[PDB]
Design an enzyme around this catalytic site. Structure first.
Site, PDB file in Angstrom:
ATOM      1  N   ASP A 134      -8.269   7.033   3.018  1.00  0.00           N
ATOM      2  CA  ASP A 134      -7.147   6.275   3.558  1.00  0.00           C
ATOM      3  C   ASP A 134      -7.203   6.188   5.081  1.00  0.00           C
ATOM      4  O   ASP A 134      -7.543   7.154   5.770  1.00  0.00           O
ATOM      5  CB  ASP A 134      -5.833   6.942   3.120  1.00  0.00           C
ATOM      6  CG  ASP A 134      -4.623   6.037   3.290  1.00  0.00           C
ATOM      7  OD1 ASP A 134      -4.559   5.290   4.297  1.00  0.00           O
ATOM      8  OD2 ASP A 134      -3.730   6.083   2.415  1.00  0.00           O
ATOM      9  N   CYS A 162      -9.111  12.221   1.506  1.00  0.00           N
ATOM     10  CA  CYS A 162      -9.123  10.824   1.124  1.00  0.00           C
ATOM     11  C   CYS A 162      -9.688   9.975   2.253  1.00  0.00           C
ATOM     12  O   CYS A 162      -9.765  10.396   3.410  1.00  0.00           O
ATOM     13  CB  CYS A 162      -7.712  10.346   0.776  1.00  0.00           C
ATOM     14  SG  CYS A 162      -7.671   8.717   0.004  1.00  0.00           S
ATOM     15  N   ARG A 216      -4.976   6.398   7.034  1.00  0.00           N
ATOM     16  CA  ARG A 216      -3.929   7.208   7.631  1.00  0.00           C
ATOM     17  C   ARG A 216      -4.130   8.702   7.433  1.00  0.00           C
ATOM     18  O   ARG A 216      -3.458   9.490   8.114  1.00  0.00           O
ATOM     19  CB  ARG A 216      -2.562   6.800   7.061  1.00  0.00           C
ATOM     20  CG  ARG A 216      -2.392   5.294   6.889  1.00  0.00           C
ATOM     21  CD  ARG A 216      -1.061   4.919   6.220  1.00  0.00           C
ATOM     22  NE  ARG A 216      -0.939   5.476   4.878  1.00  0.00           N
ATOM     23  CZ  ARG A 216      -0.581   4.794   3.795  1.00  0.00           C
ATOM     24  NH1 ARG A 216      -0.321   3.497   3.846  1.00  0.00           N
ATOM     25  NH2 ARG A 216      -0.472   5.433   2.631  1.00  0.00           N
ATOM     26  N   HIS A 256      -3.038  13.304   0.001  1.00  0.00           N
ATOM     27  CA  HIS A 256      -1.969  12.806   0.860  1.00  0.00           C
ATOM     28  C   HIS A 256      -0.975  12.034   0.014  1.00  0.00           C
ATOM     29  O   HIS A 256      -1.188  11.810  -1.186  1.00  0.00           O
ATOM     30  CB  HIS A 256      -2.521  11.923   1.978  1.00  0.00           C
ATOM     31  CG  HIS A 256      -3.310  10.750   1.485  1.00  0.00           C
ATOM     32  ND1 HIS A 256      -2.750   9.505   1.285  1.00  0.00           N
ATOM     33  CD2 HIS A 256      -4.616  10.631   1.153  1.00  0.00           C
ATOM     34  CE1 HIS A 256      -3.681   8.668   0.862  1.00  0.00           C
ATOM     35  NE2 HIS A 256      -4.822   9.326   0.771  1.00  0.00           N
TER      36      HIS A 256
HETATM   37  C1  LIG Z   1      -4.825   0.723  -5.695  1.00  0.00           C
HETATM   38  C2  LIG Z   1      -6.089   1.455  -6.060  1.00  0.00           C
HETATM   39  O1  LIG Z   1      -6.884   1.034  -6.927  1.00  0.00           O
HETATM   40  N1  LIG Z   1      -6.297   2.601  -5.416  1.00  0.00           N
HETATM   41  C3  LIG Z   1      -6.239   2.655  -4.018  1.00  0.00           C
HETATM   42  N2  LIG Z   1      -5.013   2.749  -3.441  1.00  0.00           N
HETATM   43  N3  LIG Z   1      -4.986   3.561  -2.243  1.00  0.00           N
HETATM   44  C4  LIG Z   1      -6.240   3.966  -2.057  1.00  0.00           C
HETATM   45  S1  LIG Z   1      -6.664   4.977  -0.733  1.00  0.00           S
HETATM   46  N4  LIG Z   1      -5.299   5.344  -0.003  1.00  0.00           N
HETATM   47  O2  LIG Z   1      -7.273   6.193  -1.262  1.00  0.00           O
HETATM   48  O3  LIG Z   1      -7.509   4.222   0.174  1.00  0.00           O
HETATM   49  S2  LIG Z   1      -7.377   3.458  -3.212  1.00  0.00           S
HETATM   50 ZN   LIG Z   2      -5.716   7.855  -0.793  1.00  0.00          ZN
END
Ligand SMILES: CC(=O)Nc1nnc(S(N)(=O)=O)s1
Ligand SMILES: [Zn+2]
Ligand SMILES: CC(=O)Nc1nnc(S(N)(=O)=O)s1
Ligand SMILES: [Zn+2]
Lengths: 204, 204
Positions: free
Chosen positions: B52, B50, B54, B105
């Site tokens: 993210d 991902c 984190r 994750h």
């Molecule tokens: C709320 C939505 O539309 N999705 C997202 N939320 N977390 C995401 S992430 N951790 O992959 O960056 S994307």
């Molecule tokens: Zn994510």
């Protein structure tokens, strides 16, 4: 040998250098960092760079929960690629990032390939086309870098980052956020042979 | 802010963080690492996780030039995406990676987002379709855990990682490289609240 992992490394090898990671943060910062990561993320920056194993955003040494990363080949921002454009949508709409970085790097084989004609095969040829368009849009210049190839690849590298920038500036969420002034955007080059970052003057 | 940077941070603060980063590798490893990076790259792993802030590969505490990375929203592998499929082609055909990793994750909002009935908007709705299609494909199982949604998300995030793994094995190069046994592929989960990774069993 000099690197932390190896191709022979066993699964547990990987998990060990992960066990370290966990340990390293819990010492320098205790449990605070991980209690926040579990509650939610409020990153201040989104990083858009090349997938190269050397040009990762590690070059900024940041704690998890700070930098929103997206990495592909040659750090290209294609308007017609739902992968990138979708990341931008989320980085600005929901997280309200305060700085966007698009970073190319020296020794980007995706650039050296663009300067070659030898077809690559599969999707890469098409995926790298947006840089080939730059190669043609600025040959009158690039032709001069003949006997100095390294400088040629660097210049096209910078131009690719510049192109990826103007492309992200035309995204609706990014355009709407700039005119309001609630976001900044920078272009950068990661020098692979030194680890330093260099900012790029961005034309208007 | 316990984080290294802050949303109000200036440009100058980012360079210092980079300058630091450069100092660590040199202190602990000399000019060696950046001399090797300056020559080329020969990573041993492909990381697909991902985007993210984190769940970045920094949870492996690796040096530059070790991990070829690609990251997008929800760590999804769709055979109709240029960026990802292109990374897979390059990682196996050229870099001759020895192991690939797909890592979802926890608290991956892309998963929780696919667990709501309302639309997100923009280009994101159709980027997450592979996940929603999996939620549908496995509601016989998702029909449980409704007692506590946290466990439900942990299962869908899992299933998403799995699906991305088989789709990856469907790449021609990947299919060819695995049959030859010249490569491994693993599926993992990054528990965000504890920083530990967790291997995931990948069936046939
Ligand atoms: C709320 C939505 O539309 N999705 C997202 N939320 N977390 C995401 S992430 N951790 O992959 O960056 S994307
Ligand atoms: Zn994510
Ligand atoms: C076909 C192609 O893209 N060539 C590559 N060479 N180096 C790359 S890199 N620096 O993005 O990992 S990609
Ligand atoms: Zn590159």
């Amino acid at each position: 040998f000099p690197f932390t992992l190896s191709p022979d490394s066993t699964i547990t090898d990987y998990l060990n250098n992960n066990k370290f990671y966990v340990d390293s943060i819990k010492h320098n910062h205790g449990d605070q960092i991980f209690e926040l990561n579990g509650k939610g993320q409020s990153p201040h920056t989104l990083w858009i760079g090349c997938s190269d194993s050397r040009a990762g955003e590690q070059c900024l040494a940041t704690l998890p929960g700070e930098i929103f990363v997206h990495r592909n080949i040659a750090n290209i921002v294609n308007s017609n690629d739902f992968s990138s454009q979708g990341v931008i949508q989320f980085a600005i709409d929901v997280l309200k990032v305060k700085k966007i970085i698009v970073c190319g790097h020296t020794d980007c084989g995706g650039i050296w390939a663009s300067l070659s004609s030898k077809k690559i095969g599969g999707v890469l040829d098409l995926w790298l086309n947006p840089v080939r368009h730059i190669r043609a849009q600025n040959l009158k210049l690039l032709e001069q870098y003949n006997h100095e190839p390294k400088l040629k690849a660097r210049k096209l590298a910078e131009l690719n980052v510049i192109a990826s920038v103007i492309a992200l500036k035309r995204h609706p969420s990014a355009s709407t956020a700039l005119k309001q002034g609630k976001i900044e955007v920078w272009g950068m080059i990661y020098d692979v042979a030194s680890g330093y970052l260099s900012e790029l003057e961005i034309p208007q």
